[PDB]
Amino acid sequence: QPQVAELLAEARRAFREEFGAEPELAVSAPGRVNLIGEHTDYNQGLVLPMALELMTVLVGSPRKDGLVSLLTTSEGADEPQRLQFPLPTAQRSLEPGTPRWANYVKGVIQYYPAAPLPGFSAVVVSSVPLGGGLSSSASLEVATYTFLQQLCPDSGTIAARAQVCQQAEHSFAGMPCGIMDQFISLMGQKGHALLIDCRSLETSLVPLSDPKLAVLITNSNVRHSSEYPVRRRQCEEVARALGAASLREVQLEELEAARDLVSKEGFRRARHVVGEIRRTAQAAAALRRGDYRAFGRLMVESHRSLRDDYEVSCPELDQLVEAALAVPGVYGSRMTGGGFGGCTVTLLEASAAPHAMRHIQEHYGGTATFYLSQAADGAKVLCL
């Protein structure tokens, strides 16, 4: 996978060809994979993501124009890959429009809490596959936010940055996500997974640094997204039915006692959340002591839960997981992200990765892409 220096150079060449000068500021923000703890973040639960070596790099310079001039080199983006617009004012504010990819940067600008924000020129380069479930969106948003910090440093907390980037995805991209993706992109540490408590936003670094251990990401290359807001609504319905603020304050037994207060579908939805939250806490402890096969088994429980109770999996994802579990050296595997496509995360012995890639691909009714990634750092400034 491409490294920051190679990407930074690509962004510099493109900025030169496009604007005639060298960029003055450089910034990067990684993608992410969730090892376990799915569909718990908007339930104030626990998550265990790690930052990927896949990355977004932004280079640029301030302008006197009050204008924003943007260029992205990613081919999978909505055309046109270039866009320019004036800075928002108290009079007129930015508006979500076309091209779609620029809405992510527009939103971060609109909700940035510091002033005065100058105009700027910038080019975007990325090794994060757009729409593949590794949070290219969050990578883009956090990169933009980190870039704006160079033009106009902010005062508030890191959590505010995550919430600023999340607000943008809500209002300008129309996707009501949780804080997880933005948070891991901001808070990742290389050679570590990040156990995130989405109620208190307290953070715990769980070491992930074993040359014998590999994390295999498999993209199903499918994306069937309209049920995510439906699941979010169901969980809230069950929390009200039980007189609770969120499903995090609910454990299985209390859910069992109140079975008749919620719908049958609602009960299965809540059962995943309550069970995933505990599975996540168990996986963090298992990972601290190096119990990889225990962690792998918790990964498979998560997948079963996501497949049957939460119903956000799909045949492609299910087929990928089973093939992965047939390969020797695999500790566990499951879908990651929202579901209905996207990627599969697999914990396995590093030596088994080549064979795992061959076996998974051969038993998959479709084209599969693979990324072998280590735990990486979060957003950072790059000195040019």
Next chain:
Amino acid sequence: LRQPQVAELLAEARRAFREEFGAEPELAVSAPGRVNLIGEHTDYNQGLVLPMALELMTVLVGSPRKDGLVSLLTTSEGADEPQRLQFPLPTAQRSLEPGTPRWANYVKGVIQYYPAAPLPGFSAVVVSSVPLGGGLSSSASLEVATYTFLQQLCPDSGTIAARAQVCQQAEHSFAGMPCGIMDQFISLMGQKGHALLIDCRSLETSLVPLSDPKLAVLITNSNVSEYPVRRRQCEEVARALGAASLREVQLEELEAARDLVSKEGFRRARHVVGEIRRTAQAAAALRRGDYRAFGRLMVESHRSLRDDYEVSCPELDQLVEAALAVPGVYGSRMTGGGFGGCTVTLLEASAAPHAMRHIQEHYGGTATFYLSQAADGAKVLCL
């Protein structure tokens, strides 16, 4: 009440570097000081600590040299004279040695133990808003700033923890101060708006949010060793009880071994076992926002540090008592090694102005105040 900003420090550091070396510095770096909310003298006992990084800071600017020489200048007034120094890099033949001035030992030690090569010569000026000798770990601030600087000359491979241990080894061998890992760890690991619960046995770390406009952290500098003796006693008591460190001992088991240790040694161990338990309790109190409970654990810590560990002094005890009389104050205690230094006070934000007035008026000396938030750890500054 006083606190310089990063840009002001960076600008001050370049002016000094320009006046001294004739060119603009090429590299810039920063590393914060620290205040320990609770968990004192437990770190080298494999215990728990709850520090936060301060807005008080060391900024280092410099550039590589072709000389193979190191040229240093610090503008800190409390620094050992002379504040200018030049010396050659360590070689396979001759290695650096702790000499004079004392302050140069901190950078020399980090240089000697830096794990990467080849290290070029460099010029650098140090500026700092951390009071030297005030208990906010200016030493660790200087070391971590240095380490981050050398990473610019020659990036390292290892982990952040490895960087902390290099800076800790430097303080041991070149400063003659057998400290624990806490100060180096927080200077590298701090995150703004967060305290760091550090398990000094396993090095597990938790970022605990500290971001409440209703809550203020008041640091009081009294403006005023025995440390290696305390570390020795703890080791003396741990072997006597057949344990690797005081962390594996609970209060009741220590009472059984009363005849196995000296009277002083028993009191030392009683503090550690109780401080470790208080630190874990204070972190839990913080998660639920129970500031009153957190303040009480802070005051118990001071009592323990004053009576059993005896690392406080009359000035600190006077500052702590005055602070506890102020309404809105949750608790107060000494921080750092002791025998002087600063006092940390958790209080209602609205009470800060009165607390500073009350403490100052009832203190037999001139006191300095810092109203600080949890700050970020070491970072590179792009010039």
